[PDB]
Design a binder for this molecule. Structure first.
Ligand SMILES: NCc1cccc(C2CCN(C(=O)c3cccc(NC(=O)[C@@]4(C5(O)CCC5)OC5(CCC5)[C@](O)(C(=O)Nc5cccc(C(=O)N6CCC(c7cccc(CN)c7)CC6)c5)O4)c3)CC2)c1
Ligand SMILES: NCc1cccc(C2CCN(C(=O)c3cccc(NC(=O)[C@@]4(C5(O)CCC5)OC5(CCC5)[C@](O)(C(=O)Nc5cccc(C(=O)N6CCC(c7cccc(CN)c7)CC6)c5)O4)c3)CC2)c1
Lengths: 243, 243, 243, 243
């Protein structure tokens, strides 16, 4: 998270950290608890090549990575079959947990938006995670969960911005219809935030609008952060995740 | 180049080295001289973001990088407008030199294929460059130009290999019709070879079939190297480069 | 620490962590609390060049680095005047804190040896710290304090091992009389343990025999760890540190 | 070499490069040809631990490393038995070549000073090599031999300078009597120059005054480069090297 600050302990009860087996169970991506037994993340965190389920675990909301881990095994990785790279799209994946989580005030699910939900441009939304604090700058120990408020932008404007200073033809699309953009040169998601949630409080209720997916670096001029647009994939989500 | 040998001095008179300004004019991609004032290379070497032309030079064929440099400045970078990433495609670009070079047996242009040539399996094809000699393994000093003979694999066969060990659905095409595949687990291009030529000998004349573009790693199982298919982009090249 | 285990919370109440200012207050050496206003450490951690005091803090015993920091500023760095490099010797220094700390069962001083104690082989001695767990292998998050029991080797025996596999003449002393040797190819201190304590239990009271100083690598054949011999420098310590 | 420039091809005919076996025969230290069959270098290049002679080779004067190597095997490494570290001293070593070199105008020996030679303070002397061009800044390809003129300083002044900004007692010697200092914050030797020569033209004749040994970094304030003083070790040199 670039430009953010450390979250309050009572916020973001759905944030999860994805861990890979090595010298220690290292954080490599975020995710969100969308059902007691399912985590929503980015395909590129876990694909497109098949990975060993035994080398993946999930950690539910922690204020500081690694301090009090209680790592959870995964029973299935479901990567959207249309995924090959983030810039092509379909950058979305589910992780089925071995057990359903017992939810509490502190750890519980996020609400998915209705299909008809229109997150208007400029709506203040929040992105969270334990990623880099700027380009090639790791989050320091003790690894606090960070948050930053990022305004939604229209795809047409996000696409336009990505063409400024690029050779790509102005009619050749960069920001696809299954993506969603937010952020600016002061506030953005970054590497290691991928897979985590972009949430908007709509009339009092938090909804997950996006999954951190890509961008050209972090908080660079005319390069806002790009997310997988949750409404676009609700039908695929609900093919696996009970409603 | 993986599994090469050092090229003989008399071979590959069209090979060029693209240099970026820093503590020294460092090689980052290859190219090919296709006219006395024009180099063909990969878009991803110079795009999709617009670069300062002053920080780019071209070196004509050299047997060892850096030892006898005579760097040439570039007047225009022209990147295919459909280009955004190598995985999507249109990974092709042109550099116009500030001056026409003088040709000789030593240093001369490569012939572009006619539109009809498909370069089927069994064609004798070579890829050349100053790239890594294996995954994350630099070409050592004195940086000789290397070559390797690479077997062509039909696109559909290549596409199918790319799906092995992947989550991506089998009907979601990875290897696109503007690409071409060549190489195996012994013989491949690698990072720093990008933008260089894949040339095949057809009725006694070397024709540039491909531009080194991407792959999953270098000489990895089921992951042949991928090249931009030059025939696809002849009309575009001809918008800029004279007969 | 090589071949350790994580220390129990109730052990080693004198262990401290020395921090340097940067993107975060990063651990670079250990120390020991020998009086409420004084930390003992290795000269090479803070010398021989004079450092900005403002860029140095001390952390009192912590079970995991960084998670619950309460950093303390230092008023004086006092480095043994004979010190230039750890191989020459006098690898010993004192930090005076700006305030006296409050002691407890949790956090308290270590007892210095009487001048007469030699710490011969077979004494039960432990070394503790937050250093590497093997050569070029960091302690992973969550950075627990580690301990390992290390066998003492008499100086002359140690000196003789240091000559094995070396060109240095056998009568040119390597392991000096102000050093002490402990450890083997399973059990050793390592980088980032420097300045921390080697403590041995003598008639029911833990005495600090040594300050982690140097070695050829960590747990390498014929290369036990080398510590500054605290008895050697008692008079110097007592110039500064009260009874 | 810091602050220098590329040498003329006709200068420094005695410079040699020491090579270690790996992915390529990499330069790691310099040396000087002091007899047709002997190279003078620094002990720390090849010691104090014993190394495999099969993994060492010598390269005679090259204008650019690696371009035209003709590597020579070594028949014996003689490390001064008083050597353990550069800061202690005796940082001098000989390498006996498998064959005597046929000397020429281009490649030939340097003259050793008489024992009585006094290189006065301020005498302009030259240091050469293929080392770093500043702290942690490698010499770029194509690796030209560099030179820099460095004035000799008296040991007493060099020692004094190393005490400025240090905790080491002003009467505790840092720059020993078997060392010699030269250089300043604009001109110095650096890492990878170790083992090479410091030469002074005395009344028309080049003599080797020093062997590059150590310093605190390169071209840092009050930290001139430190060399092994050749006159000090003439008797040891001439114990092995014919006169
Ligand atoms: N043997 C043939 C041959 C010949 C020559 C060269 C090679 C190479 C090709 C590359 N390669 C692969 O294995 C490889 C394979 C398949 C796909 C890819 N490409 C990628 O997936 C990737 C990545 O995006 C994944 C991590 C980088 O790598 C590519 C291919 C060459 C570079 C790329 O197309 C690429 O780098 N994409 C890209 C495109 C646009 C922006 C960014 C970028 O700036 N990022 C940093 C910021 C980050 C981010 C994360 C979270 C949030 C934000 C928002 N602030 C941003 C997103 C990525 C990255 O895609 C690489 C190694 C060998 C092989
Ligand atoms: N298991 C016990 C244990 C516990 C804690 C820690 C460890 C470590 C200890 C260090 N270690 C060794 O293997 C080791 C072993 C023996 C000796 C040494 N020391 C050295 O020889 C060295 C070097 O000087 C050799 C390269 C660095 O390393 C030391 C020991 C700790 C650091 C040192 O004392 C040291 O660094 N010396 C030093 C002293 C003064 C200046 C410079 C320096 O700034 N240099 C950079 C510039 C360079 C230079 C080259 C050419 C020309 C110039 C002139 N401009 C300068 C010279 C070195 C370096 O000596 C290191 C790894 C494990 C082990």
């Amino acid at each position: 998270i670039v430009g953010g600050q450390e979250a309050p302990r009572s916020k973001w009860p759905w944030q999860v950290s994805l861990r890979v087996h090595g010298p220690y169970w290292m954080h490599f991506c975020g995710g969100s608890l969308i059902h007691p037994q399912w985590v929503l993340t980015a395909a590129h965190c876990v694909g497109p090549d098949v990975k060993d389920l035994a080398a993946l675990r999930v950690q539910l909301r922690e204020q500081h990575l690694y301090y009090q881990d209680q790592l959870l095994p995964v029973s299935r990785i479901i990567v959207h079959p249309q995924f090959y790279t983030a810039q092509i799209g379909a950058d979305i994946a589910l992780l089925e947990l071995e057990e359903p989580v017992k939810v509490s005030s502190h750890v519980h699910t996020v609400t998915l938006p209705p299909a008809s939900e229109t997150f208007p441009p400029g709506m203040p939304c929040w992105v969270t995670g334990w990623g880099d604090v700027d380009n090639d700058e790791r989050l320091p120990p003790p690894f606090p969960l960070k948050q930053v408020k990022v305004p939604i932008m229209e795809n047409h404007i996000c696409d336009a911005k990505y063409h400024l200073g690029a050779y790509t033809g102005d009619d050749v699309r960069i920001v696809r219809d299954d993506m969603l953009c937010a952020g600016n040169t002061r506030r953005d998601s970054c590497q290691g935030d991928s897979g985590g949630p972009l949430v908007c409080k709509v009339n009092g209720t938090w909804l997950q609008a996006g999954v951190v997916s890509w961008g050209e670096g972090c908080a660079q001029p005319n390069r806002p952060g790009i997310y997988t647009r949750v409404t676009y994939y609700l039908d695929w989500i609900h093919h696996y995740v009970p409603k």
